[PDB]
Amino acid sequence: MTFEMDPINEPTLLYVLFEVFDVARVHQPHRGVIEVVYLRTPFSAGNAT
Amino acid sequence: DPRHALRDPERKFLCDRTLWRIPFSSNFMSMGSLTDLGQNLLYANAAHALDMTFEMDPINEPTLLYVLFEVFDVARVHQPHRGVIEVVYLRTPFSAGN
Amino acid sequence: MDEYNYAALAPRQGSRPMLSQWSGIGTHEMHGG
Amino acid sequence: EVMAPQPTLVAEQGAMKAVPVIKPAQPFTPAVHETQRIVTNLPITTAVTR
Amino acid sequence: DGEGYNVAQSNMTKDWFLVQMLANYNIGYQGYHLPPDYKDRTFSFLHNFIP
């Protein structure tokens, strides 16, 4: 994807943000232990098995 | 000489460029990176707090301690597709997030 | 046997290529002293 | 014919009795290992212990 | 020091010398021999311990 916009003298930065599907699941097994998992389906920082 | 003037010993040692080491092992030996302790249930399954107390010789100008707790600082680098670089950092005994 | 493994890449010593030991890959250097 | 599932491995080392462990690496040997397609439709060959 | 835990001929105590040797070279239990050269480096204990 490419953008062309009006030119302004001061340097600027584009703020395109991809609408990922970000969701976290919280499970608390027992007595003060908390463990969560994260999933950002289009742009994720995942892990192997 | 026969004309000596008494005697009073005073001994000392001068160790330079050395970090004093106190390994977290039961026998203080170095028989593995994942030590004897820090792996059993007593110290790897419950909560504990240190109360380390240092007594040291006085110095006129201000000084500062350099206690560095030896930890497991590891990184894992994954390169899936031609310019994608993803790295996982994990510092075990002192957590540093993901 | 040179078809089931990378033996042509390793330098030879006559007819037997000089491969490393299997438990040679990997390293671990770590101490605070 | 879909490839039969491979069993997951969990070894023991020290007091640690449930460390997740991948299958150990072995050099390919025709006597012990053979190449079998994961999916019969498309050729993705891999080594199995016969 | 009245009971005499001073180690070698310096100001340091025996229980600290044992720990330092064990931590660095693993010597203490089976004697107190000098470690090999490759084990004794710049960031070591006996390389700099000067009584």
Return d(Cα B38, Cα B34) in angstroms, integer. Answer: 7
B48–chain E nearest CA distance, Å: 23
The 8-class DSSP code of residue C14 comes to: S
User: What is the rounded radius of gyration, in angstroms, for the C-alpha atoms of chain C?
Assistant: 15
Beta bridge partners of A22: A40
8 Å CB contact of D15 and B40: yes
CA-based angle A39:A41:A42, to the nearest 5? Answer: 140
Beta bridge partners of B76: B88
Q: How far is CA E43 from CA B21, C26, C32, D35, D41, in A?
A: 11, 25, 9, 52, 61
User: For residues B26 and B32, is the Cβ–Cβ distance under 8 A?
Assistant: no
Longest dimension (CA), chain B: 87
The 8-class DSSP code of residue C12 comes to: B
- List the 29-48 stretch of A: residues with Cβ below 8 A of B: 45, 47-48
Substitution target from A34, A44, A47 for chain B, most B beta carbons within 10 A: A47
How many contiguous H segments (helices) and E segments (strands) does chain D have?
0, 4
Collect all residues with Cβ–Cβ distance below 8 Å to E9 and sequence separation of at least 6.
B11, E51
C22–chain B nearest CA distance, Å: 21
Identify the CA nearest to A5 among candidates A17, A16, A19: A16
Return d(Cα B19, Cα E20) in angstroms, integer. Answer: 10
Q: How far is CA E6 from CA B27, E1, E12, in A?
A: 21, 7, 5
Identify the CA nearest to E50 among candidates E15, E11, E6: E11
The 8-class DSSP code of residue C23 comes to: G
Helix (H) or strand (E) holding D27: none
Q: How far is CA E8 from the centre of its chain?
A: 8
SS3 string, chain B, reads CCCCCCCCCCCCCECCCCCCCCCCCCCCCCCCCCCCCCCCHHHHCCCCCCCCCCCCCCCCCCCCCCCCCCCCEEEEEECCCCCCCEEEEEECCCCCCC
User: What is the rounded radius of gyration, in angstroms, for the C-alpha atoms of chain D?
Assistant: 14
Q: Does C2 touch chain D (CB under 8 A)?
A: no
Identify the CA nearest to B55 among candidates B44, B65, B69, B68: B65
Identify the CA nearest to B11 among candidates E16, E32, E13, E46: E13
Structure method: cryo-EM
Q: What 3-state DSSP class applies to D29? A: coil
Cβ-based neighbour number of residue A15 at 10 Å: 5
Return d(Cα B28, Cα B40) in angstroms, integer. Answer: 16
Return d(Cα C17, Cα E7) in angstroms, integer. Answer: 55
Amino acid (one-letter) located at B19: L
Cβ-based neighbour number of residue B67 at 10 Å: 8
Token output for B61: 């100008």
Return d(Cα A25, Cα A27) in angstroms, integer. Answer: 7
Return d(Cα D34, Cα D31) in angstroms, integer. Answer: 8
Q: How far is CA D16 from CA B72, D4, D12, in A?
A: 17, 30, 6
Q: How far is CA B56 from CA B33, B63, B64, E38, in A?
A: 30, 11, 12, 32
Q: Looking at chain B, which residue has its C-alpha nearest residue E51?
A: B13
How many contiguous H segments (helices) and E segments (strands) does chain A have?
0, 2
Longest dimension (CA), chain A: 59
Return d(Cα B15, Cα E11) in angstroms, integer. Answer: 11
